[PDB]
Homo-oligomer: A and B are copies of this chain.
Amino acid sequence: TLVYTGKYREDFEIEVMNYSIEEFREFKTTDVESVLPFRDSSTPTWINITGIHRTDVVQRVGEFFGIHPLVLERILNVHQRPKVEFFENYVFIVLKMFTYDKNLHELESEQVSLILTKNCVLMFQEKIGDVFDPVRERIRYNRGIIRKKRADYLLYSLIDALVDDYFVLLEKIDDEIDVLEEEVLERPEKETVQRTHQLKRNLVELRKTIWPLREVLSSLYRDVPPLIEKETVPYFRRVYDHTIQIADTVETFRDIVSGLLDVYLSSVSNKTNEVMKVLTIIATIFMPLTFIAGIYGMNFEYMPELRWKWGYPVVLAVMGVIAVIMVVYFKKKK
């Protein structure tokens, strides 16, 4: 049985985009029954179910299209590494889309499940919001192929779109690293340490996903049953290559960011050491001088030096000389 583990409740819509070599149709219903017929449609269809907290709908569709119910349980469990299972009817794919909110610097991950079946691609999102608008455009307009190709290319097209998003995400992150690696060693901030730890954390979650993502495309690139080897596989290679390019970049960032707090310590240590130097040069000229001026404010009666008309200047002289010898001796430090 079938519980949704996610946290996304409010949304529910269904997009259909049935398209053919000439002329492409598209609606948004909230009525699951209206979409089911496309199961049997002779040109490719992209049924996009947003809001799988509506588990009833996932059940109805899973049954009608003939998806083993363990798969439907996976689809609904969003805490899960990217993966690919092949079957007799259908390929089942689980992916993540990320979203990096600058400002408060945290990244959410929605989970997108794709099933390729017959001439359909089923898509299961958690909440409205996705990366796929490029693919909608290409269908609505035409811009190269996609119109001309079957549902396996549709799947290619979607998975490409999603992986291209990761590049945009990494750009945002590289940008944050550059900011951060400045804050640490020139212009620091209240929240620098926090952010540095945040960034580490995000990179972890990111890395944990990309390595598996590289597997799923490794699978879609070698053995490939109802994907037309004749055409589609070289495209799925293009995307596989991208995920390698991506996985490298993340290793780079993790590597780099691991040093930042160590830089930040070294900075603060400097900065503290400079504070202490100042305190010390001040303390170490004026404490003995105030001690001397403290002696000659003693109210003792056998105080011969107090008589001198030349004694007041001579202390000012010795107080000054002691101070000048000190400042010289601080041709080590400051």
Contacts and interface: CB of A to CB of B under 8 A. Distances in A.
A306 interface: yes
A186 to B, nearest CB: 8
A333 B272 CA distance: 11
B205 A252 contact: yes
Q: How large is the interface on A (under 10, 10 to 19, 20 to 34, 35 or more residues)?
A: 35 or more
A42 B186 CA distance: 60
Contacts of A280: 275-276, 278-279, 282
Given A245-B81, A308-B301, A70 B234 contact: yes
Given A255-B204, A273-B272, A300-B306, A284 B278 contact: yes
Nearest to A267: B193
A106 to B, nearest CB: 12
Interface of A: 1, 68, 70, 73-74, 79-81, 83, 144, 167, 181, 185-186, 188-190, 193-194, 196-197, 200-201, 204-205, 208, 234-235, 237-238, 241, 244-245, 248, 251-252, 255-256, 259-280, 282-284, 286-291, 293-303, 305-313, 315-316, 333
Q: Which 9 A-B pairs have the closest CB atoms?
A: A293-B294, A300-B312, A302-B309, A296-B298, A297-B297, A286-B287, A279-B280, A272-B273, A282-B284
Given A188-B273, A265-B269, 18 more contacts: A190-B267, A193-B266, A193-B267, A262-B262, A264-B269, A268-B269, A268-B270, A273-B275, A279-B280, A279-B284, A282-B288, A283-B283, A290-B291, A290-B294, A291-B293, A293-B294, A297-B297, A297-B298
